[PDB]
Amino acid sequence: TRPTVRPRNDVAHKQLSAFGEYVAEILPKYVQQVQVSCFNELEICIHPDGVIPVLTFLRDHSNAQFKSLADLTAVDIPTRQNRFEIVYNLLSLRFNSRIRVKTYTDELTPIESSVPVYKAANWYEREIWDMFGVFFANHPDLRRILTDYGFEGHPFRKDFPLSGYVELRYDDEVKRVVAEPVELAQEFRKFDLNSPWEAFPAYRQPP
Amino acid sequence: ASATRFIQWLRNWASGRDLQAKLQLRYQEISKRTQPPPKLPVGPSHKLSNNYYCTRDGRREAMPPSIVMSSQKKAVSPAPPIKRWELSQDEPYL
Amino acid sequence: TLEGIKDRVLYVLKLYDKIDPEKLSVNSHFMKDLGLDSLDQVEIIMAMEDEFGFEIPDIDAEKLMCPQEIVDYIAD
Amino acid sequence: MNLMLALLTNFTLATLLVIIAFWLPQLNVYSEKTSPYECGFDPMGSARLPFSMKFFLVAITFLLFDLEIALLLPLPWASQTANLNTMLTMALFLIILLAVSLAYEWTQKGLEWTE
Amino acid sequence: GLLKKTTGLVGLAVCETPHERLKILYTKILDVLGHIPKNAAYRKYTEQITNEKLSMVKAEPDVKKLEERLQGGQIEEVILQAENELSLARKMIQWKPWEPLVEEPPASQWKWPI
Amino acid sequence: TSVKPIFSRDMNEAKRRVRELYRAWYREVPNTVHLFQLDISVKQGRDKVREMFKKNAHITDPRVVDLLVIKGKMELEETIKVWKQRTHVMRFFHETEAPRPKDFLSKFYVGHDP
Amino acid sequence: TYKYVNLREPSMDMKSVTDRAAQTLLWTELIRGLGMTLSYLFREPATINYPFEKGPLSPRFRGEHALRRYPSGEERCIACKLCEAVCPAQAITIEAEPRADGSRRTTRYDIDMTKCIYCGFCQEACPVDAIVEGPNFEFSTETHEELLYNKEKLLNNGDKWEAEIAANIQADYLYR
Amino acid sequence: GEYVVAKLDDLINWARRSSLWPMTFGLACCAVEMMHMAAPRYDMDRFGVVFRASPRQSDVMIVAGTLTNKMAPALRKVYDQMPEPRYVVSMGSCANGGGYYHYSYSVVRGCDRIVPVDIYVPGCPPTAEALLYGILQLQKKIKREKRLRIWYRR
Numbered sequence A: 001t002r003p004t005v006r007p008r009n010d011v012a013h014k015q016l017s018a019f020g021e022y023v024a025e026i027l028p029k030y031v032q033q034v035q036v037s038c039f040n041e042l043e044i045c046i047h048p049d050g051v052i053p054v055l056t057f058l059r060d061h062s063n064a065q066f067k068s069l070a071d072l073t074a075v076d077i078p079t080r081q082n083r084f085e086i087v088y089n090l091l092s093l094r095f096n097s098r099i100r101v102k103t104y105t106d107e108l109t110p111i112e113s114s115v116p117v118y119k120a121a122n123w124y125e126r127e128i129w130d131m132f133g134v135f136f137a138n139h140p141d142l143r144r145i146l147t148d149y150g151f152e153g154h155p156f157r158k159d160f161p162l163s164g165y166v167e168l169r170y171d172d173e174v175k176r177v178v179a180e181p182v183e184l185a186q187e188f189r190k191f192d193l194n195s196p197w198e199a200f201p202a203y204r205q206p207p
Numbered sequence B: 001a002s003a004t005r006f007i008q009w010l011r012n013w014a015s016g017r018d019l020q021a022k023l024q025l026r027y028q029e030i031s032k033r034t035q036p037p038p039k040l041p042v043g044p045s046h047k048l049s050n051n052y053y054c055t056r057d058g059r060r061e062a063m064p065p066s067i068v069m070s071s072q073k074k075a076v077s078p079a080p081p082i083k084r085w086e087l088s089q090d091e092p093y094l
Numbered sequence C: 001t002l003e004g005i006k007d008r009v010l011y012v013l014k015l016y017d018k019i020d021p022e023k024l025s026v027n028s029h030f031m032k033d034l035g036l037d038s039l040d041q042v043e044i045i046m047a048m049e050d051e052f053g054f055e056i057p058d059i060d061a062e063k064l065m066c067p068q069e070i071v072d073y074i075a076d
Numbered sequence D: 001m002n003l004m005l006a007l008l009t010n011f012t013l014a015t016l017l018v019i020i021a022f023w024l025p026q027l028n029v030y031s032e033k034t035s036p037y038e039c040g041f042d043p044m045g046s047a048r049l050p051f052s053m054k055f056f057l058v059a060i061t062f063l064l065f066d067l068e069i070a071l072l073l074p075l076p077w078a079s080q081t082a083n084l085n086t087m088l089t090m091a092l093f094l095i096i097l098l099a100v101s102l103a104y105e106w107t108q109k110g111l112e113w114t115e
Numbered sequence E: 001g002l003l004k005k006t007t008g009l010v011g012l013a014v015c016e017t018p019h020e021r022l023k024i025l026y027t028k029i030l031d032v033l034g035h036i037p038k039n040a041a042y043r044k045y046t047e048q049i050t051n052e053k054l055s056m057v058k059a060e061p062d063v064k065k066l067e068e069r070l071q072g073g074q075i076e077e078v079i080l081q082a083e084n085e086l087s088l089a090r091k092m093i094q095w096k097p098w099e100p101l102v103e104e105p106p107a108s109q110w111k112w113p114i
Numbered sequence F: 001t002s003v004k005p006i007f008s009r010d011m012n013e014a015k016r017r018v019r020e021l022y023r024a025w026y027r028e029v030p031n032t033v034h035l036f037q038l039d040i041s042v043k044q045g046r047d048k049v050r051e052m053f054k055k056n057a058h059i060t061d062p063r064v065v066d067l068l069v070i071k072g073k074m075e076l077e078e079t080i081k082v083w084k085q086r087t088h089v090m091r092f093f094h095e096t097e098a099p100r101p102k103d104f105l106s107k108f109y110v111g112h113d114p
Numbered sequence G: 001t002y003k004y005v006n007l008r009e010p011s012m013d014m015k016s017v018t019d020r021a022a023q024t025l026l027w028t029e030l031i032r033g034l035g036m037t038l039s040y041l042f043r044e045p046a047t048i049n050y051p052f053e054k055g056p057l058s059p060r061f062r063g064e065h066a067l068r069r070y071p072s073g074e075e076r077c078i079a080c081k082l083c084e085a086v087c088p089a090q091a092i093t094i095e096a097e098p099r100a101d102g103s104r105r106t107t108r109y110d111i112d113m114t115k116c117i118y119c120g121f122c123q124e125a126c127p128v129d130a131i132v133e134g135p136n137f138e139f140s141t142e143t144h145e146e147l148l149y150n151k152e153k154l155l156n157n158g159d160k161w162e163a164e165i166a167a168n169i170q171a172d173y174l175y176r
Numbered sequence H: 001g002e003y004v005v006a007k008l009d010d011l012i013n014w015a016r017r018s019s020l021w022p023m024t025f026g027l028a029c030c031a032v033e034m035m036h037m038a039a040p041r042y043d044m045d046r047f048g049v050v051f052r053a054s055p056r057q058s059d060v061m062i063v064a065g066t067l068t069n070k071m072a073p074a075l076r077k078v079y080d081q082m083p084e085p086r087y088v089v090s091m092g093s094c095a096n097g098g099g100y101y102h103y104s105y106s107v108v109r110g111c112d113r114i115v116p117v118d119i120y121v122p123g124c125p126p127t128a129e130a131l132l133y134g135i136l137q138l139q140k141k142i143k144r145e146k147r148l149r150i151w152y153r154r
């Protein structure tokens, strides 16, 4: 018990590993990877076709009972062929446990809407569509939720610029708010912070 | 604190409490605004020996995730079922 | 009212200004002779819905490519 | 006369105040300033569109109850009659029938607003 | 044991005959699982946990004691879970997730960091 | 080269969706000018609709077309339900933009941008 | 553990029933609520008499920025740019060069006070206590441009407020 | 002549600054410190400052928080719907110049791109007392107006 180091909990690591292979055994059609992190978080990585079967099994199965959808988000990784990682964070009140389910898609491929599994997903999927452009099929009412009406682009994409492409002001001539190409009085200053020396050997990637 | 006895009585009766014992205006029961200097303690790693950083480096004990299954016997649940909460003995019914 | 159908249809096409009324003929093809594009054709079809007052589903609409074809469709 | 004088003064003063209010201040009128208010965003449709009344049945019953008072307001004068035996019976009769009508509408859910 | 007046959860009505209702639902689940292939892990695992729950219901006639044994909250919560499991079993027949993986991911689809 | 469709399985199916959207936009312009009290004409608005459809006439991916129609339908829903304000509707006309000459010499005089 | 906030079945004895009928008809619980606001009417109000009376602050208060000096009058800032790097709002802009005597000093030190989040990170990062957030919070202006501070403004703030700034730093530096 | 209009300015100015009614209009964090200025310790009402929800019955707009592009047309609308004279107080870094979201694609870099601003109150958020300083600074601005004196000399 060193004061500055986070303690490691191995009973949970074993419990999550056991349930991880339990899920993989039951749903081999869709499960591609199962892993447990060093802070004890189980992640299931699945084929996108299995969004509804996997989530439904986790919600309803007596040994799962993940009744609460904590969060549904996406991550943009431009280097990947399927750049968008879709992340479901589920909570089980019965077993006081959490699980993360991950799938993927690209710009032109839709994902089945999980609203039929969790009604919480309605606005989460609207946010993912609005900020990343990932279309969800058979969504009850898909449309922008966070951006301005008529806004073009998906800001949370890595290739979308931080300050966007347009900006607003009030023009007295036309007596309304107008949109114009963005010019900044002070450009945002890019900082190169990365140290040129490796920090974490344990995560080194083979050459 | 300057209220007269009659007014103290009146607002006590109207409220139904003894308002004077727990006034909401602060007087001289608060800490002084000039305090003596502190002398704060140091942490466990303030040693001159037996203190090599490589024995107390949390970031370097972090490891990548354990791959349980990669596509490259009894049933289990994620954890034991949660115990049912017990009612409070302090005040079970508000 | 078959006789009046032909007259009404050509009345619509006269209003539409993308086409020359002297170039116009009951057999002239919208895309070929008249030089119109697809959207232009869609606009013409909408103008007929307003006139004869009934829907012209897209499956039907794309076939109607000459003034004569429209009058034939109206008959039903 | 006095009453007519009093009413004229009251509404004459009110009109004078409105006149002053409209011609004293400096005005700057333009379209956006005078556009209909609705929390910063343009109104969606006309405010002249029909506005459903959920208490419509209570509103009609008010018309019938609002005429009971005309029949009952003479009661202080009626109490001066020689024929008090007939009075009290008829006064109590009207109020009871008014109470019965209220009970009927109440028990038949006429006072519940439509959803 | 005297019947409850409330389950404590809004919208979850108190069940008058929990033991019989559970036996009906557990039997139905076992009937539905008979149409799944014997080698499917869903069948073997769901049958196992189902038979353990059904055995408890048949051996404990007291609703309080039975709730303590099932460890699933109020007995009406257990009935709801049984209904949810039965709903899943029917869906799994259409999905057939015991089939082999539909598709491998691209080479570095799950590699992190890049 | 086998991918999951969005709606239309091929260009012919996609184009039908485009024309259905175009009709809806064409029919809505008179209401938009009336409802938003725009000073433009019904012709000016309909010309703008044509211009927005014409700039995407070179697409040959049925999936890219389906997304354009999806965004067009959402764009129309905001207008009809008056979620957009007049500022949002008039952003299509860039009324406060000083025209930017597109010839080499005019660009050469004004700055370094190509 | 848990407790029930609203799960009590009221008693049905004629005294308790009659007590509640009196409550319904005589408005006793609404009268009781009137007693509470009456009691407040006769309490001394908590209002202070601003600007003649001020609210209490602490030596850690994060207010208007100022650039400080050494007792000799030399500037403490050595253009290390640690404050500019840590600024979460990118509100700091710095340029530096060797001074006429070779000293490492800034020729630009701007704080855009309409970008700043008054977070105090800059005074944590500074290794020489050059940039601080002083105790002044009453510097609202009539124009936006007046809130774009350059080095001359910030140095004047340091000279203006140094007497108080030094005393506050003296009271709190042992917690840092 | 000069003496009468001089006193008349003093009167209309005194009435306008002694009876300042801000629009009930807050945007984000800074609206919390606006509440604390209405709370007992500072009691804005004692200066004659009273919140009123309707723009028609408001004299001051206190822009208290971040102005996004989506909100910008609405803020301009309710400002235009105030009768004159009207004043705008820009409260906090976000309203003053975008602040900590200055470089965001969805934020207006200062509410003075949308409305004219009389007073800028710095801080993130300005303390309740700092806002009260700004309101009293706006009052002293109104005390210096010379509407009739200038009219007389036209």
Ligand SMILES: CCCCCCCCCCCCCCCCCC(=O)OC[C@H](COP(=O)([O-])OCC[N+](C)(C)C)OC(=O)CCCCCCCCCCCCCCCCC
Pocket: D019, D020, D023, D024, D025, D026, H008, H011, H012, H147, H148, H150, H151, H154
């Ligand atoms: C309970 C009842 C309470 C009633 C209270 C009534 C107010 C009592 C205090 C009155 C003091 C005087 C108020 C003057 C305010 C004028 C508004 C203003 O500031 O505008 C600036 C203007 C100055 O405008 P300007 O000429 O400098 O420029 C205007 C153009 N732009 C906007 C481009 C700058 O003042 C005036 O124009 C004239 C000042 C008149 C002052 C004397 C009042 C006479 C007005 C008579 C109007 C004629 C119609 C009769 C109306 C009935 C009158 C009783």
Ligand SMILES: CCCCCCCCCCCCCCCCCC(=O)OC[C@H](COP(=O)(O)OCCN)OC(=O)CCCCCCCCCCCCCCCCC
Pocket: G024, G025, G026, G027, G030, G031
């Ligand atoms: C000899 C034979 C004699 C025959 C005659 C004998 C008659 C004596 C007995 C008559 C009954 C006495 C009470 C009469 C008053 C009316 C009582 C009443 O109406 O109360 C009920 C009413 C509704 O309450 P609620 O519980 O919500 O509804 C019932 C639930 N289904 O409750 C309410 O009205 C709620 C009111 C809410 C608003 C209150 C705000 C003001 C409260 C403070 C005012 C205090 C009183 C001030 C009086 C001023 C007088 C000048």
Ligand SMILES: CCCCCCCCCCCCO[C@@H]1O[C@H](CO)[C@@H](O[C@H]2O[C@H](CO)[C@@H](O)[C@H](O)[C@H]2O)[C@H](O)[C@H]1O
Pocket: D084, D085, D086, D088, D089, D092, D093, D096
């Ligand atoms: C659904 C229909 C419901 C109908 C309900 C009608 C209720 C009526 C109840 C009876 C009301 C009057 O009841 C009657 O009042 C008169 C007083 O005015 C009384 O009469 C008494 O006082 C009068 C004068 O005041 C004397 O002249 C008389 O000698 C004396 O008997 C009667 O003794 C009493 O029986």
Ligand SMILES: CCCCCCCCCCCCO[C@@H]1O[C@H](CO)[C@@H](O[C@H]2O[C@H](CO)[C@@H](O)[C@H](O)[C@H]2O)[C@H](O)[C@H]1O
Pocket: D095, D096, D099, D100, D102, D103, D104, D106, D107, D108, D109
């Ligand atoms: C002579 C004057 C004085 C006599 C009183 C005259 C008015 C009598 C009013 C009607 C009284 C009986 O008729 C009334 O019917 C409704 C049926 O919807 C009953 O029941 C209803 O009332 C209450 C309040 O609406 C609800 O909480 C309840 O859920 C509902 O069942 C009332 O409890 C009863 O009071």
Ligand code: SF4
Pocket: G083, G086, G087, G088, G089, G090, G091, G092, G111, G115, G116, G117, G118, G119, G120, G121, G122, G123, G133
């Ligand atoms: S207080 Fe924070 S935001 Fe302001 S200048 Fe310092 S570091 Fe930057």
Ligand code: SF4
Pocket: G076, G077, G078, G079, G080, G081, G082, G083, G084, G094, G122, G125, G126, G127, G128, G129, G130, G131
């Ligand atoms: S103010 Fe301090 S931290 Fe900033 S550049 Fe100067 S010495 Fe460095």
Ligand code: SF4
Pocket: H028, H029, H030, H031, H064, H065, H066, H091, H092, H093, H094, H095, H099, H100, H123, H124, H125, H126
């Ligand atoms: S200025 Fe600061 S407190 Fe005010 S809204 Fe912006 S971030 Fe929040």
